[PDB]
Amino acid sequence: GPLGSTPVKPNYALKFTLAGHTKAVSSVKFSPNGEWLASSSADKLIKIWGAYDGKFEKTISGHKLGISDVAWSSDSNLLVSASDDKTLKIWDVSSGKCLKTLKGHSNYVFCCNFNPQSNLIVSGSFDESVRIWDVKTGKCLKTLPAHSDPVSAVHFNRDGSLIVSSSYDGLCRIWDTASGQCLKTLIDDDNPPVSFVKFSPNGKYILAATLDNTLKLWDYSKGKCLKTYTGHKNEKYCIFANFSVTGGKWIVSGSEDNLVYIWNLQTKEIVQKLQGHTDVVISTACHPTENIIASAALENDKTIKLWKSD
Amino acid sequence: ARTKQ
């Protein structure tokens, strides 16, 4: 919009606060077609909300325990969610009904994701494994003995040929989806738990979060750390982190000081901090085409806020 | 749950 596309700093501003979840919100995700927003919560439910007006839409349910993650498919037609009931469920966002219940993990399922071709589901559990599922057959294709502690994040690259995973075991791993073979391990000489990780939108980099109030940008081919983003508080929870591109080029993340941080990807300088939540901001999301950010707070707050910028 | 430490 009106400010650059390479502005000095953006001016995100609160436009809506969504309320409905009776417990702590875990994550929020904008549909690929940018029309919706889905949120998972400790209250065992998933909620859909209009991306631009914030208006409540529907409540998809079925999980027996808490849901720590929820993700969309490319066609914006399905959702997958990681629950403490030890399962993952495929959902028809249209009918709100549960299509498949992926059974296999022996502990909580902490994270999940579809591949671009939406025929596969990657999952991360407490049991320290990473599983690849078949969306149609609802069966498990592989059980990667990925880490030696709980797995905090799982993500596919542009063509779903690679899977990146994180764990409290202080490790970041890249997997070959086809063979399930461990291709690379991003390591550190301190080994702080890795709370989050994700491929960049061009696939050349990995954005990772460690519980030492730090965010890192990695060149995975080279296995080198290019950027280090700091200034916030993250030592206890697994806060998702995003790549903002629609307007400027930022790295966005929730925080434990109840704020939302926005950093310049190149300079690593904080450019803006969104104030409004009254408890840790565990999840943020960046709108696919418009400068819209979606933040979600913990039980102490229980809301979701939508911020728009120029 | 992601909402618990």
Curated annotation (Swiss-Prot), chain A:
Q: Where is this cross-link: Glycyl lysine isopeptide (Lys-Gly) (interchain with G-Cter in SUMO2)?
A: 23
Q: What is the effect of changing residue 299 to A?
A: Strongly reduced affinity for histone H3. No effect on interaction with KMT2A
Any idea which UniProt keywords this protein has?
Acetylation, Chromatin regulator, Host-virus interaction, Isopeptide bond, Nucleus, Repeat, Transcription, Transcription regulation, Ubl conjugation, WD repeat
Q: Outcome of altering residue 298 to A?
A: Abolishes histone H3 binding
**Residues with PTM N6-acetyllysine:** 89
Q: What result is annotated for mutating residue 110 to D?
A: Strongly reduced affinity for histone H3
Cited function: Contributes to histone modification. May position the N-terminus of histone H3 for efficient trimethylation at 'Lys-4'. As part of the MLL1/MLL complex it is involved in methylation and dimethylation at 'Lys-4' of histone H3. H3 'Lys-4' methylation represents a specific tag for epigenetic transcriptional activation. As part of the NSL complex it may be involved in acetylation of nucleosomal histone H4 on several lysine residues. May regulate osteoblasts differentiation.
Q: What is this protein called?
A: WD repeat-containing protein 5
- Gene source species: Homo sapiens (Human)
